[PDB]
Design a protein around this motif. Sequence first.
Motif, PDB file in Angstrom:
ATOM      1  N   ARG A   2       0.876  -1.175   0.000  1.00  0.00           N
ATOM      2  CA  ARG A   2       0.000   0.000   0.000  1.00  0.00           C
ATOM      3  C   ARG A   2       0.912   1.223   0.000  1.00  0.00           C
ATOM      4  N   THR A   3       1.239   1.702  -1.199  1.00  0.00           N
ATOM      5  CA  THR A   3       2.109   2.856  -1.380  1.00  0.00           C
ATOM      6  C   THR A   3       1.308   4.135  -1.601  1.00  0.00           C
ATOM      7  N   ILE A   4       0.142   4.245  -0.971  1.00  0.00           N
ATOM      8  CA  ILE A   4      -0.678   5.444  -1.086  1.00  0.00           C
ATOM      9  C   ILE A   4      -1.627   5.504   0.101  1.00  0.00           C
ATOM     10  N   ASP A   8      -0.939  10.921   2.396  1.00  0.00           N
ATOM     11  CA  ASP A   8       0.152  11.054   1.444  1.00  0.00           C
ATOM     12  C   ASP A   8      -0.244  11.830   0.198  1.00  0.00           C
ATOM     13  N   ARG A   9      -1.477  11.664  -0.279  1.00  0.00           N
ATOM     14  CA  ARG A   9      -1.946  12.460  -1.405  1.00  0.00           C
ATOM     15  C   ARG A   9      -1.941  13.938  -1.055  1.00  0.00           C
ATOM     16  N   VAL A  12       1.634  15.253  -0.783  1.00  0.00           N
ATOM     17  CA  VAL A  12       2.157  15.530  -2.116  1.00  0.00           C
ATOM     18  C   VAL A  12       1.577  16.828  -2.657  1.00  0.00           C
TER      19      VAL A  12
ATOM     20  N   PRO B  47     -25.161  61.426 -57.187  1.00  0.00           N
ATOM     21  CA  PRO B  47     -25.535  62.646 -57.905  1.00  0.00           C
ATOM     22  C   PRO B  47     -27.000  62.996 -57.793  1.00  0.00           C
ATOM     23  N   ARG B  48     -27.841  62.057 -57.435  1.00  0.00           N
ATOM     24  CA  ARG B  48     -29.267  62.287 -57.403  1.00  0.00           C
ATOM     25  C   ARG B  48     -29.662  63.017 -56.125  1.00  0.00           C
TER      26      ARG B  48
ATOM     27  N   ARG D  72     -20.759  32.794 -34.384  1.00  0.00           N
ATOM     28  CA  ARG D  72     -20.746  32.313 -35.746  1.00  0.00           C
ATOM     29  C   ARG D  72     -21.462  33.246 -36.701  1.00  0.00           C
ATOM     30  N   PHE D  77     -21.253  33.067 -40.667  1.00  0.00           N
ATOM     31  CA  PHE D  77     -21.603  31.662 -40.820  1.00  0.00           C
ATOM     32  C   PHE D  77     -20.694  30.984 -41.837  1.00  0.00           C
TER      33      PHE D  77
ATOM     34  N   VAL H  31      -2.658   1.819 -13.852  1.00  0.00           N
ATOM     35  CA  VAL H  31      -2.236   0.944 -12.770  1.00  0.00           C
ATOM     36  C   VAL H  31      -1.245   1.662 -11.876  1.00  0.00           C
ATOM     37  N   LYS H  33      -0.983   4.701 -11.292  1.00  0.00           N
ATOM     38  CA  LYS H  33      -1.676   5.713 -10.508  1.00  0.00           C
ATOM     39  C   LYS H  33      -2.195   5.164  -9.192  1.00  0.00           C
ATOM     40  N   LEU H  34      -2.327   3.845  -9.069  1.00  0.00           N
ATOM     41  CA  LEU H  34      -2.771   3.256  -7.816  1.00  0.00           C
ATOM     42  C   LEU H  34      -1.615   3.150  -6.836  1.00  0.00           C
ATOM     43  N   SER H  35      -0.495   2.599  -7.292  1.00  0.00           N
ATOM     44  CA  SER H  35       0.684   2.417  -6.468  1.00  0.00           C
ATOM     45  C   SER H  35       1.545   3.669  -6.383  1.00  0.00           C
ATOM     46  N   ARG H  36       1.052   4.802  -6.873  1.00  0.00           N
ATOM     47  CA  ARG H  36       1.720   6.078  -6.703  1.00  0.00           C
ATOM     48  C   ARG H  36       0.691   7.157  -6.419  1.00  0.00           C
ATOM     49  N   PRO H  37       1.110   8.294  -5.856  1.00  0.00           N
ATOM     50  CA  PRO H  37       0.120   9.312  -5.496  1.00  0.00           C
ATOM     51  C   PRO H  37      -0.287  10.199  -6.654  1.00  0.00           C
ATOM     52  N   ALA H  80     -23.537  22.208 -45.026  1.00  0.00           N
ATOM     53  CA  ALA H  80     -23.242  23.362 -44.199  1.00  0.00           C
ATOM     54  C   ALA H  80     -24.353  23.600 -43.196  1.00  0.00           C
ATOM     55  N   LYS H  81     -23.973  23.763 -41.935  1.00  0.00           N
ATOM     56  CA  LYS H  81     -24.919  24.040 -40.863  1.00  0.00           C
ATOM     57  C   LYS H  81     -24.927  25.530 -40.623  1.00  0.00           C
ATOM     58  N   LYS H  82     -25.595  26.235 -41.493  1.00  0.00           N
ATOM     59  CA  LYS H  82     -26.050  27.571 -41.177  1.00  0.00           C
ATOM     60  C   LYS H  82     -27.309  27.391 -40.338  1.00  0.00           C
ATOM     61  N   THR H  83     -28.080  28.441 -40.144  1.00  0.00           N
ATOM     62  CA  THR H  83     -29.283  28.293 -39.363  1.00  0.00           C
ATOM     63  C   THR H  83     -30.394  27.690 -40.204  1.00  0.00           C
ATOM     64  N   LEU H  86     -31.924  29.920 -42.663  1.00  0.00           N
ATOM     65  CA  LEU H  86     -31.118  30.220 -43.828  1.00  0.00           C
ATOM     66  C   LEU H  86     -30.926  29.023 -44.735  1.00  0.00           C
ATOM     67  N   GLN H 111     -33.597  53.116 -63.925  1.00  0.00           N
ATOM     68  CA  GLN H 111     -33.423  54.303 -63.107  1.00  0.00           C
ATOM     69  C   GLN H 111     -32.161  55.008 -63.568  1.00  0.00           C
ATOM     70  N   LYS H 113     -29.480  58.045 -63.694  1.00  0.00           N
ATOM     71  CA  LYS H 113     -28.927  58.943 -62.702  1.00  0.00           C
ATOM     72  C   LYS H 113     -28.634  60.286 -63.342  1.00  0.00           C
ATOM     73  N   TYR H 114     -28.748  61.325 -62.531  1.00  0.00           N
ATOM     74  CA  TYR H 114     -28.963  62.669 -63.022  1.00  0.00           C
ATOM     75  C   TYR H 114     -28.551  63.639 -61.931  1.00  0.00           C
TER      76      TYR H 114
END
Lengths: 58, 49, 125, 84, 71, 207, 50, 118
Positions: A2-4, A8-9, A12, B47-48, D72, D77, H31, H33-37, H80-83, H86, H111, H113-114
Amino acid sequence: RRTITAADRRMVSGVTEKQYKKGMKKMQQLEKNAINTQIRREIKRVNFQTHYRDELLQ
Amino acid sequence: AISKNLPILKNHFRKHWQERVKVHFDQAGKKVSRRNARATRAAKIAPRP
Amino acid sequence: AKQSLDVSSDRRKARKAYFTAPSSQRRVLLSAPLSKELRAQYGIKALPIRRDDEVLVVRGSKKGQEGKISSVYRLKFAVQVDKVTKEKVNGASVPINLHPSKLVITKLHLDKDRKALIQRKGGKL
Amino acid sequence: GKGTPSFGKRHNKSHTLCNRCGRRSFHVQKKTCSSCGYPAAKTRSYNWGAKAKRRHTTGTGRMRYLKHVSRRFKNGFQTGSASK
Amino acid sequence: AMKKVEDGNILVFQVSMKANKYQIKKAVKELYEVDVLKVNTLVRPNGTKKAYVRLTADYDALDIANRIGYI
Amino acid sequence: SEKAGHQTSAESWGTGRAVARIPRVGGGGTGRSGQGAFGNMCRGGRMFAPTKTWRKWNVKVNHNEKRYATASAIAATAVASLVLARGHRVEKIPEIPLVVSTDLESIQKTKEAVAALKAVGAHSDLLKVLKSKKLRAGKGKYRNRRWTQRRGPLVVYAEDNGIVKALRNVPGVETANVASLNLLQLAPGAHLGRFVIWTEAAFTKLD
Amino acid sequence: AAQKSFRIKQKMAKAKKQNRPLPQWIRLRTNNTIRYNAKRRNWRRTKMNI
Amino acid sequence: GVKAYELRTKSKEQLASQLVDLKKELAELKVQKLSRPSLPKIKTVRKSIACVLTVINEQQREAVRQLYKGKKYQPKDLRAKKTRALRRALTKFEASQVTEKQRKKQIAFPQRKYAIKA
RNA sequence: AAACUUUCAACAACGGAUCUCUUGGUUCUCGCAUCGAUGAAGAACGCAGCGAAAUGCGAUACGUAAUGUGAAUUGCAGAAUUCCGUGAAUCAUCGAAUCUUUGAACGCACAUUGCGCCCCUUGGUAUUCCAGGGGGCAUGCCUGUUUGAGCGUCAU
RNA sequence: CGUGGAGGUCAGUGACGAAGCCUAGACCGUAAGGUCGGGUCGAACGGCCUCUAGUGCAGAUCUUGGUGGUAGUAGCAAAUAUUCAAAUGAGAACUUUGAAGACUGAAGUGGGGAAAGGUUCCACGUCAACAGCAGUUGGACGUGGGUUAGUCGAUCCUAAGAGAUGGGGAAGCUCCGUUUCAAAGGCCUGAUUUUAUGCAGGCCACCAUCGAAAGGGAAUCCGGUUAAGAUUCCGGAACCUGG
RNA sequence: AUAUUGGCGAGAGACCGAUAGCGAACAAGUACAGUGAUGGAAAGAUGAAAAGAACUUUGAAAAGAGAGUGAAAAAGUACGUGAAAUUGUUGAAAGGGAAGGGCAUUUGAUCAGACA
Ligand SMILES: [Zn+2]
């Protein structure tokens, strides 16, 4: 093998057992300091029953 | 009530008028918006008139 | 004074933007001026502070002391300097949490991506 | 007694956990949550429960998808690999 | 659990909650190259799952536990 | 907020008890249960006549009164007794309706503008400003009004070429046109008198 | 009870893993304002209604 | 550690092997991680696995793209995942349609222009 | 006379007002229009080397990829000139992915971690039994296709 | 007279100590109140001309918070009853072991279970708070361990009943109704794998689904074992279902 | 053109300044109550920097006393200042079934200005 242990935690990760004991006792102190206030600010409006029947007519 | 020699005065505040109130704080904040819109349109149609 | 509309003169907003700034904006808030020799050599006045920069203190109880940076604690907005410490009662020593504005850079931890910065700021080698 | 004796017999529930709101409101004899009628597709929300709407409306959760929509949109988008 | 390894030829594992005593058999067969005759699963009160696998005789569990690295 | 003090659900309990008839919260398990509500007296309650937005903030004034006042406030600038009595340092001024040349309208640097104003004798009224910078008093200095200065002279141009930007930065000094003249610049605090520096073009357009 | 459901055993497990104090190394961080665990629970005092 | 711009140069089977020879490592460290802190080497392995799987999936998606180029309908995951709005809304072409009457009117009497001065 | 009771002051206590401060609120103004069956909002559970929360995230789990800056994170331990570099970081940005069980919630059902059917594939002697893996199975409505029903009905 | 803020002004006071607080210490005013000294304290604050208001409390069985006399008082008295020695410990009327006396007296103060509770189970350490006295003990504090099923239960069936579909109502949220006024469905061969079904090929009109951890129901027992698990593990001997 | 207490981003205020201002300045729609609908709080500030009290000593221990850090522990995590009610110690004074108060003066204390 049992090394923990939880001690001890936490060793550390900083805190020594002295720090643990003291900081624990402070966190216990504060809980009671608050429970004091909750028991203090409650006795007023806790007996304010809505439908007491008053067992006394004759 | 009716108390003194005063006019009879008709005031229509028996409804919930406090909800349907509109104070026009927007007067100058949107005068400038109108001006900007005119100014932008005028360049879109450069211009308008 | 200010003449734009997208910048604030609000104490609240500004202080929030300071004390919740990220570690990438804090790099520029933790800037320090250069000594009057490096101002003449590199041609700039200030730079952001970096580890392994030598430095001098100009304002504080530890004035005149020179060192070099060991850690920029840009959560405390602070900076720690070697040869600038304080002996705790235990016998141990803890370093001082300076602030960079009260420092002056004497030697620079030059590197690529700092030579470039100096170059874009109108500096020299 | 209608009080202290008749509060011993309270040992069988009428409400259980709803799958939709997670709280003890699922009635069992009628099978209808009293906070968001579960078999019904519409969540209960009355305009007189204006505080209750605050407790269960948008914002009160994670907003897994929704909170990236404004990001987004700001960018158009858009699609594809970023840059160099 | 480190008693049941020597007393019986039993290994104790922590497994995913979505596992069903066949997946476990085949996983052990695959990873540790053994044979299994019995699996007993339970769900611990911390929301994990525990698996007592019993190996066939002709397979000692101490060898496998040392080979894994936890004795 | 219109909903302040009214988010609570509360009703009086009434006569029959030893407590008042103020509305009280119902429920239990927290401190609020039994507390008073909905009143002006009550903690958590509302206020008395909550302040509304349909108050008269802006006030109408007659155009000829405004102009009367502006002309009076202009005429007071020519009186040194009122200027001195109002907080202006003009003891070493040659002539009070101070008329400097119209080349001040073409200055583009603060370094030059300040020198001109020092020459025509406003140096003391600028020192007055930048030595009067004291901190505000009260809860207005975490409301973006931390500092208080004194007012300085008022430069009155007619055709700006850079003066209004040059003097933009110096403390106290303001800048105006002969048209578009402001009573809040000529009579601050309703105090008549103000040190005004006219240009000759302005002075000639004032007719 | 004993003859229970997994939907409830889950929620009891969560409450078991929640029923601990606060780690003491949280209190040493810089801008800390957490003194204790204010959401604690025990069977004597507060029942979790599930 | 392991790095994407190195993994993109590798193939399907190599990455599939790298996954396994990382998962073995992770099973060993779980493993220890068990035998160490404390074992912080474990995080690099988890992120390595993720960086591997990411590359695998992205290769596979690009493959299906190259398969579905030009084909009118491609999968919803790749679209494409827009909304929703859309995707439901009108196409740029469908909206810029006109009757013959209107386009004749537009080409005839546009139209102009003028400006206002002699 | 002391004790005791009362009044004032000093010091100490109970308690937390006042003064100063304020990453908060409220109100006004300006601009913008962007949820969802390509599976929303919300919920449950879980994830960290040491975290119960909040925040973040989903078995790729306080996050992966890409882009930018360009040497940190820091409570502790642990890594480290990889630091004149395809490159640190509880960074910023974000266009690529993942996205557990759910939920309008979609195989049926749900006080159940319940019960099925179809296709491909693997194993067990296996079109039929068992298990694993992957992918599918809702309803209403529209267009079109395919197969049909009806002395409703036409011709031969 | 006073208060919070605003515009001007005294180039006002101030870390050599602003504001605030205490002061049977002083002065001014009829008074509201102002001013000074001292002590404390640590960062902003005032006088004058005007503006403005969420502007002055002894009360409202006022609201919130806090505190007292009552008062070391009423009282901690149901359920036959405790005692001795030692050990541990700073410390034992209350812990542990032993010896004695007694009680529940098999419709129990026992052994097990349903609901419900949720890890209260067990171990190590520990006693600031809790156990209305105490406490070295504890259902408490802290850290961990612990619940093993082909045969026990759920799962399956239906009950009283609930509830979709088709339909019909309804402004509509949705209501009726559960076989109705529906074109409501699948099972075996020759075709001998073209498994399509051309014929074959006939067979009611049945027609969701939920609903019981006490009803119905496929199958198991002994012995041993753990700090805490067992008709579940180990040993042995058996049984059922589906292939 | 118009509306907009919601959402996203911004700028400001003769506004509130922690019993106020949103219910929430803080792990707030949190804890907690209730079968449920629903109800619904309290809680901010050490110090520039933890330098958060090494070491000695009495105690079973908490702690205490010294020592020390600090500009200041009259800042010791129950920490900015730290009011009052209420309370303890010291000092002064009084007191036959109340106390307090008004006018007048003695006695004691204290202040005064010194016309120096
Ligand atoms: Zn629900």
